[PDB]
Design a protein around this ligand. Structure first.
Ligand SMILES: *[C@@H]1O[C@H](CO)[C@@H](O[C@@H]2O[C@H](CO)[C@@H](O)[C@H](O)[C@H]2NC(C)=O)[C@H](O)[C@H]1NC(C)=O
Ligand SMILES: *[C@@H]1O[C@H](CO)[C@@H](O[C@@H]2O[C@H](CO)[C@@H](O)[C@H](O)[C@H]2NC(C)=O)[C@H](O)[C@H]1NC(C)=O
Ligand SMILES: CCCCc1nc2c(N)nc3ccccc3c2n1Cc1ccc(CN)cc1
Ligand SMILES: CCCCc1nc2c(N)nc3ccccc3c2n1Cc1ccc(CN)cc1
Ligand SMILES: *[C@@H]1O[C@H](CO)[C@@H](O)[C@H](O)[C@H]1NC(C)=O
Ligand SMILES: *[C@@H]1O[C@H](CO)[C@@H](O)[C@H](O)[C@H]1NC(C)=O
Ligand SMILES: *[C@@H]1O[C@H](CO)[C@@H](O)[C@H](O)[C@H]1NC(C)=O
Ligand SMILES: *[C@@H]1O[C@H](CO)[C@@H](O)[C@H](O)[C@H]1NC(C)=O
Ligand SMILES: *[C@@H]1O[C@H](CO)[C@@H](O)[C@H](O)[C@H]1NC(C)=O
Ligand SMILES: *[C@@H]1O[C@H](CO)[C@@H](O)[C@H](O)[C@H]1NC(C)=O
Ligand SMILES: *[C@@H]1O[C@H](CO)[C@@H](O)[C@H](O)[C@H]1NC(C)=O
Ligand SMILES: *[C@@H]1O[C@H](CO)[C@@H](O)[C@H](O)[C@H]1NC(C)=O
Ligand SMILES: *[C@@H]1O[C@H](CO)[C@@H](O)[C@H](O)[C@H]1NC(C)=O
Ligand SMILES: *[C@@H]1O[C@H](CO)[C@@H](O)[C@H](O)[C@H]1NC(C)=O
Ligand SMILES: *[C@@H]1O[C@H](CO)[C@@H](O)[C@H](O)[C@H]1NC(C)=O
Ligand SMILES: *[C@@H]1O[C@H](CO)[C@@H](O)[C@H](O)[C@H]1NC(C)=O
Lengths: 775, 774
RNA sequence: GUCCC
RNA sequence: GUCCC
């Protein structure tokens, strides 16, 4: 169907709207720019390769380039792979870019460059030099950048990439970059704000440096500035998981009261980890548009109880005051200033790491009439006491987050303590939707009763994951939660003695009781898995990793359940050969469409398992079972089966004729098995098939009878990589078909490979020339 | 060093004291008996193979066989592999055993046999026919067994191997087996005790059958019987994890009051799962020697409060009354009869599954003066309340077991609920420190010193699997002045204070594994230098804690010999460019064993090895995804004896091992990506004694890499599952493997050529390379 | 591949 | 293969 096979080891995409020819060679183990890149290429990505040099030959024919992404072909040693260290810094010979008359974006991050590359064309708008070894900025090296708008220079001198000196910037180095809008000098050992900066700046990043003082005129001319980040100058170093040097004498970053007066457009001010003890109101006199203020990791514990500056912030959207606790102090309560009541626009308030014992309703009163408040984050506070009923005054909120506390009767897991939360990777550049969420995960709740939730009937999602709840539920414990749609009960010690557990939650749509294995791990104890009958609108049930090997009831029943996750249990024991009692465990889940019984140690499936499946089953996973055999003809019982996942097993054969096993099957996943050959008529007349994964098997040969053309051209995707293809003359049809097909087959360039014979070992089949088979 | 390579795919051993030649072909994927078995073989084991028949040719030459173990060459379908099902039952041709004039033991279990094989020699003492399809025993088929002493016929008719009829035994079938001592008819669908049995019987196994009634004379003549097991006749079926049919009408197994009167020698009586509601004292009138009584899984809840029969058991050593609870009843307390006080000899008492809310000191008083009592097991009782101080009255005990309860302020994990605890396979802990209180798997959320009042005698305390989410500061275990072992795993320890555990001044072993909770939340203080105060601590386990951060930079101890640090995040702690924790273990000055496997260490930053403590002997770096390894840094480890690098991604070995470590004895490199050895790999590495290179991708090994003066002082050399290329370049290695005295496992099954073409899949031990010498 | 799984 | 790991 193709006349010219594509052999370039890069993905090529056409977006004819934007006249873009997109060539993506990311992570192709290239040691040179491959030949044959399209002459019309506009976006070329070569990030993560080991191309040791650039020269005028590099992009000779590619005059239409608007973007070159040439990152991380020589990453600094501590930042890069230790198994494939870059032996030499990238070399850029003269004139490699001056021909690129339309080049607007150049990324040379992560190449151990020692200087700002010269000869760049005046069309350039974005230059990125992060994670190089450039630590002295001279005005002369910048004259070439007259039209630059975006300039990334950070991560060139810090602990993961040291330069052993202070960063140097010549006076007015940037002043004549009259279009410069974004300047990033983060993570660079900078000691002062460089001046004078061009007044076109909209975003200025100076965080993670060694700036001890702001001069009162450092930002005098920046009347267009919208984002300013000075964080991590005079850091708060307690429990830092990176080497951290504080300013002497516990001093804060010193900011004159009038330092921000020019910044009338400022929307984002980030003052994280500046060891601040006070926030002067005078800072915000002329900033009336501020929307985001980060004051986390300072020493503002007492200031939070005073906080006059909040009176100047009526348009603030987000406020972060996390991790301001005084060292070795466990306060009795949280003292929030009445001034918080003037934050009329506030949507998001975070005060993690304040560290206090008892939360009481009146302490949140400054927040009662914040009418736009959506998120209240009081996580990681070691709170021991909290009457949850107090949140009856907060029904307008979307998320109340008390995660990680000690209460008893979506940010990354590293967030406040990582070095640079916004740093780029070499590679690239949850129940809230249900309604009001109370997040009590990772607390010390050992026993629950109905009155714990009094006045919380508005809740839609309750997260109790990771508490200590070791209790037989009998339907009395959640009685006030009449509107709850989602309960996360995972990582507790549920004791399913009663089939009435959870039945008070009459609107429940999703229940997670995964990782409640404790009572399932002790022999002779009663478990009622038929508790589903009472939950009349339950759509999704997760009971993964419960180690379930026994059940007192023999059937689960539901008129509503659509999805059951049963991964990580012991159906192999429940379905012990000769024991027929549980072969219909799921049969009466009459609306069940999705069943995950992967990781159940099912080395074989006893007869009756498929007949015992509920009638509308569409999506079945049997992955990661150590399955060693499979009677494909039993799929005939699964009359609505569309997706079958058999990945990561030990199958050695496929059925003689897939179409004779299932008339409905669309998606067949067989990756990571032990298959060495296909049957002669494998896919004959399998007209419903749309997706086939045979990757990571041991296939040597595929003949045309197995893969008829009228089935292949209906496939959305066919995965074949990481097999054991033998590239002899017996393989001519398969090699020809692979080279010429339009069917999507991923990894042709790197993992659809010959293992033999001798000559062709390690060769991609897409490049294979078999003319000698036709002489 | 050998003149004749052994190519027989079986292990052959000589024990010349007993004139035994032991040939073990277990699980060799054989489809025939191999030729060339030693003519002098006395023990031949062929278990787990697919040999479809036996004939006079089978053992022609093996006149000296005393034992044939030919089990499981055709196992019943529900018991056997579904990926390699046996297609047809083992065929035994006539005259196959009659020549075996010295044969004393024949195991034919698991072969789908339909009848008792005939033509067996008169020397036979033991015959085993378990897991076949023999369900009718006729006296004529047993005449050949005149001299038999041990006869195993069980598992021929039960739910994993049905016969669809009742088992049949002819009247007096066994009577003329005048030397028969052990008879097992378990798991067989038997409906009555077969009579008359020979009076030589010492052991009679009739459990897991369908016997509804004992006749008063069923055991009349059995005056030598020492073990009788009638369990699982009229089973208690509640929560049975196997298909279970109870006797009709809720009846127990019906046993007349005098049924045991002849059994004067009886030592073991097993009446597990007989749905008994009463235990008549009259049963034990004439049994004065009984030592073991199993009454678990009956309905004896009310009998336990009465139990007059215990007065007749002054020599009982072991008593099991577990799982006798009444259905749907949660008793307030445990009512133990005073009659328990007459069990003068009792060492072991187990009452799991009695099911009661509150354990109370006076409830145990009948046990106060049982002076040989060693184990009290009250696990799985859903006890909510128990003052632990009550065990001040039980300091003589070795184990107090309250595991699996709900207390708050060594039997397998399947035991009382498995179908047959004693069934055979086809193929075949802190008590030692002293008084042990097992509180594992309860609901303890908070501990304080008074919880342990009067328990200073305890040597081992098990708190694993509780709910303890608490900062310890050294005040919580003050009375436990003698404790040597604390299992604190699977809780939520909060190491805020470096004074944690310092009150346990006799502590030698501390397990705080799987206390990851407080370690996985960022910004929290953790004091890993808490070891400094524990002056006699030998072993510390802190596996699976997800430790990625620490407030202190060094752990210190003068005593610790063993640290288990598996399943943490030293990769994050030792982030490249952060030097602060590179001496975390340096000041564990007596540390000999360090397990830092499963730490995501894809590389080791420079300084990790210099930071190791000086006496390190045994280092595991397994399961780290290690991609590179600067072998020369092993020079820092001057006492290193064992290095475990298994399950990583290493691709090379050092150019010269001897230049990396003068001390290294054991190098484990299995499951890596090594494709070739360096030219002089083991040159002059005379200290090396154990080398595991299995499951790599080695194609070729030459003598320069593997000098012989090093190889033959190796206790073991593991090479299986590689990618050996068997060309004429391999002539030295093939010869050396064929002729070496060094132990190399799996030669018969996984030391294999992958090429070239001709030799693919061929064992290197069988390889003939004469064409390389033409 | 008799119990486990 | 810049932050994660
Ligand atoms: C940031 O700059 C400081 C100096 O301003 C560097 O510190 C010097 O480091 C050298 C070599 O490590 C020492 O010999 C000097 O004594 C240091 N000088 C001072 C004034 O402390 C520091 O190394 C730089 N940081 C990074 C990450 O490169
Ligand atoms: C044990 O023996 C009983 C009979 O005593 C078997 O039960 C019969 O089984 C067949 C086939 O399942 C039925 O058609 C009969 O109706 C049954 N009869 C009665 C009276 O139950 C039973 O199958 C045997 N058990 C085993 C494990 O083989
Ligand atoms: C060995 C006992 C098997 C049956 C069982 N299972 C459980 C269980 N999963 N949780 C319990 C929790 C508290 C008390 C008893 C049980 C219990 N029990 C005992 C029990 C169950 C039910 C009742 C009636 N509420 C009384 C007692
Ligand atoms: C964001 C807090 C980091 C420091 C820290 N770590 C912990 C910890 N591991 N457990 C605690 C348990 C209770 C109270 C406070 C802490 C605590 N804290 C705060 C704290 C620690 C110590 C003290 C003095 N007892 C008071 C307060
Ligand atoms: C291509 O490059 C241009 C110029 O920098 C950029 O605006 C655009 O987003 C890029 N598109 C893709 C798909 O890489
Ligand atoms: C809260 O703290 C502020 C400042 O420390 C103080 O003005 C105020 O009185 C305190 N309020 C309470 C209730 O402690
Ligand atoms: C919690 O507050 C609610 C609502 O104000 C009140 O009804 C209840 O008494 C309080 N509960 C406790 C245990 O203090
Ligand atoms: C509940 O919180 C846990 C623990 O933080 C989290 O992993 C989980 O995704 C949350 N569940 C939902 C449904 O948001
Ligand atoms: C359920 O248990 C709760 C808590 O023990 C109790 O208040 C209630 O009486 C029980 N209800 C039923 C119907 O058993
Ligand atoms: C669940 O099954 C048990 C029988 O094992 C029965 O007692 C109970 O009533 C059932 N419950 C429901 C809700 O079906
Ligand atoms: C089938 O279910 C799996 C969950 O295991 C899901 O990830 C996948 O997208 C589903 N596929 C289809 C085609 O619905
Ligand atoms: C499978 O193929 C045979 C032969 O064409 C046909 O008789 C049979 O009905 C088919 N079965 C199914 C389930 O398609
Ligand atoms: C060898 O066979 C004899 C005869 O049954 C037996 O007594 C002995 O224990 C067996 N030893 C081994 C190691 O198989
Ligand atoms: C403590 O009990 C646990 C849980 O039953 C068990 O796994 C562990 O081996 C015990 N510890 C010791 C030291 O015996
Ligand atoms: C440790 O905590 C206990 C618990 O209340 C307390 O009695 C004791 O004073 C504390 N010890 C120290 C040294 O702080
Ligand atoms: C452990 O280190 C911390 C500081 O990192 C110190 O406060 C504490 O006293 C030390 N404790 C011991 C036992 O060394």
């Amino acid at each position: 169907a193709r006349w010219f096979p594509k052999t370039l080891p890069c993905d090529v995409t056409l977006d004819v709207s934007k006249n873009h020819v997109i060539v993506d060679c990311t992570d192709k183990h290239l040691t040179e720019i491959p030949g044959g890149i399209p002459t019309n290429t506009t976006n070329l990505t070569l990030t993560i390769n080991h191309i040791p040099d650039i020269s005028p030959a590099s992009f000779h024919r590619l005059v239409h380039l608007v973007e070159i992404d040439f990152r991380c072909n020589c990453v600094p040693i501590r930042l890069g792979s230790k198994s494939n260290m870059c032996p030499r810094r990238l070399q850029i010979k003269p004139r490699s870019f001056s021909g690129l008359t339309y080049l607007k974006s150049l990324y040379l991050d992560g190449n151990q460059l020692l200087e700002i590359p010269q000869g760049l064309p005046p069309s350039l708008q974005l230059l990125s030099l992060e994670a190089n070894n450039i630590f002295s900025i001279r005005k002369e090296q910048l004259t070439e950048l007259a039209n630059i708008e975006i300039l990334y220079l950070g991560q060139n001198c810090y602990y993961r990439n040291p330069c052993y000196v202070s960063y140097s910037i010549e006076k007015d180095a940037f002043l004549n970059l009259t279009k410069l809008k974004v300047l990033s000098l983060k993570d660079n050992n900078v000691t002062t704000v460089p001046t004078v900066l061009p007044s076109t700046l909209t975003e200025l990043y100076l965080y993670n440096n060694m700036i001890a003082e702001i001069q009162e005129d450092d930002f005098n001319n920046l009347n267009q500035l919208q984002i300013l980040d000075l964080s991590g100058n005079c850091p708060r170093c307690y429990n830092a998981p990176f080497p951290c040097t504080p300013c002497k004498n516990n001093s804060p970053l010193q900011i004159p009261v009038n330092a921000f007066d020019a910044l009338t457009e400022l929307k984002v001010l980030r003052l994280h980890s500046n060891s601040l003890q006070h926030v002067p109101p005078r800072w915000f006199k002329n900033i009336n548009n501020l929307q985001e203020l980060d004051l986390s990791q300072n020493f503002l514990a007492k200031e939070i109880g005073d906080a006059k500056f909040l009176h100047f912030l009526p348009n603030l959207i987000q406020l972060d005051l996390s991790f301001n606790f005084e060292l070795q102090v466990y306060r009795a309560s949280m003292n929030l200033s009445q001034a918080f009541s003037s934050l009329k626009s506030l949507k998001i308030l975070r005060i993690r790491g304040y560290v206090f014992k008892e939360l009481k309703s009146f302490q949140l009163s400054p927040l009662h009439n914040l009418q736009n408040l959506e998120v209240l984050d009081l996580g990681t506070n070691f709170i021991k006491i909290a009457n949850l009923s107090m949140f009856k005054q907060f029904k307008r909120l979307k998320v109340i987050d008390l995660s990680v506390n000690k209460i008893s009767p979506v940010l990354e897991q590293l967030y406040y303590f990582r070095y640079d939360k916004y740093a780029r990777s070499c590679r690239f550049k949850s129940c809230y939707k249900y309604g009001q969420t109370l997040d009590l995960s990772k607390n010390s709740i050992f026993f629950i009763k109905s009155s714990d939730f009094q006045h919380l009937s508005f809740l839609k999602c309750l997260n109790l994951s990771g508490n200590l709840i070791s209790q037989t539920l009998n339907g009395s414990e959640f009685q006030p939660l009449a509107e709850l749609r989602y309960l996360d009960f995972s990582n507790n010690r549920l004791d399913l003695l009663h089939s009435t557990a959870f039945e008070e939650l009459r609107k429940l749509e999703v229940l997670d009781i995964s990782s409640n294995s404790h009572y399932f791990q002790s022999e002779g104890i009663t478990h009622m898995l038929n508790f589903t009958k009472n939950l009349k609108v339950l759509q999704k049930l997760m009971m993964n990793d419960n180690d379930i090997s026994s059940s007192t009831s023999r059937t689960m029943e539901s008129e509503s359940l659509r999805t059951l996750e049963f991964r990580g249990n012991h159906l192999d024991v429940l379905w012990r050969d000769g024991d027929n009692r549980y072969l219909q465990l799921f049969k009466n889940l009459l609306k069940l469409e999705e069943l995950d019984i992967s990781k159940n140690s099912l080395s074989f499936l006893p007869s009756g398992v498929f007949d015992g499946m509920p009638p509308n089953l569409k999506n079945l996973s049997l992955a990661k079972n150590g399955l060693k055999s499979f009677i494909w003809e039993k799929l005939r019982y699964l009359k609505n089966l569309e997706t079958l996942d058999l990945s990561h097993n030990q199958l050695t054969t496929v059925p003689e004729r897939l179409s004779n096993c299932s008339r409905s099957l669309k998606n067949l996943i067989l990756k990571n098995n032990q298959i060495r050959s296909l049957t002669k008529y494998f896919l004959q007349d399998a007209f419903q098939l749309r997706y086939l994964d045979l990757s990571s098997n041991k296939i040597q040969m595929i003949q045309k009878t197995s893969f008829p053309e009228n089935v292949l051209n209906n496939l959305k995707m066919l995965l074949l990589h990481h097999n054991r293809f033998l590239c002899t003359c017996d393989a001519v049809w398969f090699v020809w078909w692979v080279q010429h097909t339009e069917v999507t087959i991923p990894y042709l360039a790197t993992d659809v490979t010959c293992v033999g014979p001798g000559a062709h070992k390690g060769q991609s089949v897409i490049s294979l020339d078999l003319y000698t088979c036709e002489l």
